[PDB]
Design a protein around this nucleic acid. Structure first.
Lengths: 132, 61, 189, 56
RNA sequence: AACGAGACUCUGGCAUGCUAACUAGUUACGCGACCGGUCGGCGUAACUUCUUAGAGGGACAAGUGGCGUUCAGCCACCCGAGAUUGAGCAAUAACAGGUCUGUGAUGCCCUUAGAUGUCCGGGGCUGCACGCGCGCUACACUGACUGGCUCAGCGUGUGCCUACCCUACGCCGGCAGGCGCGGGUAACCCGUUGAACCCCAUUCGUGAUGGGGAUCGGGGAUUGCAAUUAUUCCCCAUGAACGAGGAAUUCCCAGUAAGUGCGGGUCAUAAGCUUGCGUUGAUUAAGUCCCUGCCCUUUGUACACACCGCCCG
């Protein structure tokens, strides 16, 4: 079959990671830039690097890939990670406590908290999985 | 009697030396009978098999 | 427009069985002027279904060792047979070829299972492509075996079995093997 | 491959040397191995911020 | 991380694009010849399609669609000359494998002057009641014969000692050959390599026949110093087995098997061998672990100069 060995895949991964701006989807202009960037002993390896690159550039539009790391995604993930909402998800006016949680807060002298709305506790003591 | 058939999907290639393909066989009388049969020879999907005893069952030889 | 050997046309040839329709060639666009085509039919599986069955019969005509390369020998054997067929019947000689290939191939074989010397077979189906493959084999070895030490030539011995297989007679070598290949097949079932 | 004649008999000596690269200013072969792909280290593209029309 | 795998190197296939061709040509122009045709017949020019051989291109699973934890990849199809061409090279670790008969590689030993050196002469290496292997020719009609017709590719060729050749053409011979007479140290000559099956006509007519040619009796001619235990070759004649082969077993997936010739090595003489090359050219398969084996993972071992084991009467 047609499996690409570690030489083609290692070279293709570094040449994506360093020169992502020049590479696109055409295998032919990928081959014309993979022979100007790199010094490959010639064509039958040059067309195999440029073909895995042409299969690897289509794999970058659909999301990240678990090897290489390129700085058009890794700025978008950075701006996705520095994302705070306007009002936090911990600012709830009605938070729900059990009966016994309120007793722990009264031990911690937090029975004067106004936002707590004690729920009705569960009527059945049914939590274990039915063994057998 | 003799019954004429068709091929829905080839399942797998059985036999002592792998000479028999095992095939999921539809009939041609608009029948919902999807019998499984033992065919000897080259088969692809969408053939027209011809059986003599149309009530036999697929074993593995 | 396209007549085999420039004389026999293909428009009135009518395959009977639905089991062999997609596999037996010429009716429509496999019409050739000659059986010699020199094409790469063995390059993939099932590709030889799309070759004209006149070339199939020509190719299996040259089987034995002293005739193994001779294609221009066997195409004139088939051409001279297609005169004797037309004389002895009076119709188009391609309808009798598909009548012989429809009739001669078995429809239930036996697959061999046992030990070293022990034979306990079992009956299976027959794929229609193996039916076409084993039709032409029985026809051609019947023509080969009954012309060996005989004054009859190969063109007469091919034609006098290529009609006897169309008529379903049991004097032809082909139908004599098919009914026994099904007789020993039913004997296990 | 060379021979030695000792007291007791003959020895053979086989010596293999894998030579290195560095195109021949006196040493080694010119071309690299057929699987050694080298990649030119990119000088980074400087970031184009505002359209400057440099009429020179 | 390192080696082996792959990459790599040679080869096949494509290019009316580039580089150039009197030791390769095609087309055109006159001339000539015989009926606008035919010229592998003669000389000029346009040029490289055909021929040569150099650089550079070209194919990447690249495109489309299915299946894949939508990953590695697999399958089918378009466009394509092409969607696995064929080889070479090839690890670690081993073997009581072969080679002292390839060496002026070589340790020990044997022999060294009626020599185990070496030369000469003559035999033998071939001997035949019979076993065992590689093969060639066949058993015929899909054929044998006798005519006619029309196509290759890889190659080799005048040699340090060294004698030893590829041979066109004219004559004489049924023929094997014999005389001269030229060319060629070769893309210049054999050579347009005027191959064989194949193709087209006549004869033969299912019989040990005109299939098959063994084994033999006479001649003739080359090679050699020498042809008797036949060196080969030519002509008559003789005309056996063999009627498609038991148990058993070999090789093979496409320009393949098989047929069919041709070159090279050996070669004074000489291929039923081998090594390459063409030409004609298929059936069946695109699968399995049944057999024979190789391998990986679990696992039983009272085995480990290791099941050809160890061991009990």
């Amino acid at each position: 079959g047609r499996v690409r060995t570690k030489t083609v895949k290692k070279a293709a991964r570094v040449i994506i990671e360093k020169y992502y701006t020049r590479l696109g989807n055409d295998f032919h202009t990928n081959k014309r830039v993979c022979e100007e960037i790199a010094i490959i002993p010639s064509k039958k390896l040059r067309n195999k690097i440029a073909g895995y690159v042409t299969h690897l550039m289509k794999r970058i539009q659909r999301g990240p890939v678990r090897g290489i790391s390129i700085k058009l995604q890794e700025e978008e993930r950075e701006r996705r990670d520095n994302y705070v909402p306007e009002v936090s998800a911990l600012d709830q006016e009605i938070i729900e406590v059990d009966p016994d949680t309120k007793e722990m807060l009264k031990l911690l002298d937090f029975g004067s908290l106004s936002n707590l709305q004690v729920t009705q506790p569960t009527v059945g003591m049914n939590f274990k999985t039915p063994r057998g | 009697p003799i019954k004429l058939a068709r091929v829905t999907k080839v399942l797998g290639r059985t036999g002592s030396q792998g000479q028999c393909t095992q095939v999921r066989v539809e009939f041609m009388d608009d029948t919902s009978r999807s019998i499984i049969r033992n065919v000897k020879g080259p088969v692809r999907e969408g053939d027209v098999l011809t059986l003599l005893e149309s009530e036999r069952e697929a074993r593995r030889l | 427009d396209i007549k085999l050997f420039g004389k026999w046309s293909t428009d009135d040839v009518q395959i009977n069985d639905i089991s062999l329709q997609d596999y037996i060639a010429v009716k429509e666009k496999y019409a050739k002027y000659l059986p010699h085509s020199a094409g790469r039919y063995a390059a993939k599986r099932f590709r030889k279904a799309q070759c004209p069955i006149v070339e199939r019969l020509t190719n299996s005509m040259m089987m034995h060792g002293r005739n193994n390369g001779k294609k221009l020998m066997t195409v004139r054997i088939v051409k001279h047979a297609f005169e004797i067929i037309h004389l002895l019947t009076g119709e188009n000689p391609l309808q009798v070829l598909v009548n012989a290939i429809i009739n001669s191939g078995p429809r239930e074989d036996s697959t061999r299972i046992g030990r070293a010397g022990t034979v306990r077979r079992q009956a299976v189906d027959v794929s229609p492509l193996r039916r076409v493959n084993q039709a032409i084999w029985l026809l051609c070895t019947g023509a080969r075996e009954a012309a060996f030490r005989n004054i009859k030539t190969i063109a007469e011995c091919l034609a006098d079995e290529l009609i006897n297989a169309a008529k379903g007679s049991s004097n032809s070598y082909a139908i004599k093997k098919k009914d026994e290949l099904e007789r020993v097949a039913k004997s296990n079932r | 491959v060379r021979h030695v004649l000792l007291r007791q008999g003959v020895l053979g000596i086989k010596v293999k040397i894998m030579l290195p690269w560095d195109p021949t200013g006196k040493i080694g072969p010119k071309k690299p191995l057929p699987d050694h792909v080298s990649i030119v280290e990119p000088k980074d593209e400087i970031l184009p911020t505002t359209p400057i029309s440099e009429q020179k």
